[PDB]
């Protein structure tokens with residue numbers, strides 16, 4: 001009954017050499033880790049080592065051209081790095097960026113392997129740069145390689161190709177990369193909750209709407225829960241879980257649960273605009289621990305209030321360790337548009353999930 005934790009301070013090497021105040025700060029991961037110490041959570045975990053992902057492992061999800069280009073940035077001069085990064089949507093690059101994206105992925109590989117071989121029951125991965133906006137053939141939105149997607153495929157590579165993996169993505173932004181990588185796949189169920197605003201919120205694509213349910217045999221295995229017109233928080237996220245995430249997830253019966261755990265929907269985030277509390281994230285984590293016999297891996301994605309993400313992720317680890325969840329009011333009413341959103345998802349996915357009918 002062990003909880004794993006992976007953290008390597010070398011992941012702070014990735015930085016923005018032209019804007020030292022860019023919100024995707026190196027100290028995002030060091031503040032989360034130090035808060036785990038201060039709360040005496042670190043010493044309760046089994047320390048899992050970081051490692052580099054290999055190029056072969058990156059090819060599980062990414063094209064040879066994309067891997068080659070990001071790999072080449074290790075040797076580039078500053079103005080060439082700036083030119084490269086400017087070619088993407090919302091990317092900065094330093095000569096350490098490739099190595100740090102490899103360490104983020106390999107840390108999660110090591111955690112998933114410890115879970116699937118029974119060395120630990122569950123794990124938390126304090127990693128950067130994030131992953132879920134990265135596509136097979138490009139970088140985007142602070143993300144170089146899709147860590148969560150790679151971890152799902154790595155997981156399958158060391159157990160079965162049929163290993164059922166659920167990815168819950170509670171970052172405030174849609175994981176466009178994760179959706180696309182698994183869109184035609186029924187072995188990996190992708191569920192994303194995100195601020196949508198009728199397609200106006202980043203990453204600015206109607207791919208994130210509720211009517212994108214998957215393709216081919218993947219039809220029904222992509223669940224988008226898009227929020228519109230409202231500052232959402234604990235009541236809305238609890239209700240999405242009760243009405244959508246947990247019924248669908250229980251019917252899918254995953255064998256591994258990956259959380260694309262961005263904390264930019266948190267109260268205090270400078271750009272998410274939402275108000276999920278640390279208690280809220282604890283409730284979500286505890287809910288997910290009822291799946292896959294507790295085999296849950298929490299992977300940091302976004303989140304830009306240093307104190308909010310540190311408190312929020314620490315509460316998640318407290319849940320994985322077996323601490324009792326805080327009691328919340330399941331009877332506070334939802335903001336009006338959130339009911340509309342949840343109903344729109346139920347209509348779209350009832351054809352595929354008997355648990356909704």
Ligand SMILES: CN(C)c1ccc(C(=O)N(CC(=O)NCc2ccccc2)Cc2ccc(C(=O)NO)cc2F)cc1
Pocket residue numbers: 019021022023089090130133140141142171172173201202262264271301302303
């Ligand atoms: C340097 N500072 C303080 C910034 C602050 C904020 C942004 C920013 O708004 N983004 C999103 C976006 O809409 N951009 C277009 C735009 C154009 C004109 C005006 C405002 C925005 C970048 C971004 C933020 C979060 C994640 C993440 O967390 N994903 O999971 C991924 C991202 F790509 C960018 C920079």
Ligand SMILES: [K+]
Pocket residue numbers: 169170171172173174175192193194
């Ligand atoms: K999301």
Ligand SMILES: [K+]
Pocket residue numbers: 182183184185186188189190214218221222
């Ligand atoms: K899918």
Ligand SMILES: [Zn+2]
Pocket residue numbers: 171172173262264301302303
């Ligand atoms: Zn985000």
